[PDB]
């Protein structure tokens, strides 16, 4: 956690409906946006901090 990895996502089409097939989580916690609407939006960049 102190050296958390960060990855930058750009120049791609992001389908957020396959994120359920990668990790056995129960639900998103989305602030400022709703999890079901993510596929209808364009973002300038995405950052995945793990």
């Amino acid at each position: 956690v102190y050296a958390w990895n960060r990855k930058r996502i750009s120049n791609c089409v992001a389908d957020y409906s396959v994120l359920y097939n990668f990790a056995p989580f129960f639900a998103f916690k989305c602030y400022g946006v709703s999890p079901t609407k993510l596929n209808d939006l364009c973002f300038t960049n995405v950052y995945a901090d793990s």
Binding site: V33, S34, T36, K37, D40, L41
Partner: peptide, 9 residues
């Protein structure tokens, strides 16, 4: 309307 579901919007 575009960024939120009906309950949240």
């Amino acid at each position: 309307l575009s960024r939120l579901d009906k309950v949240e919007a």
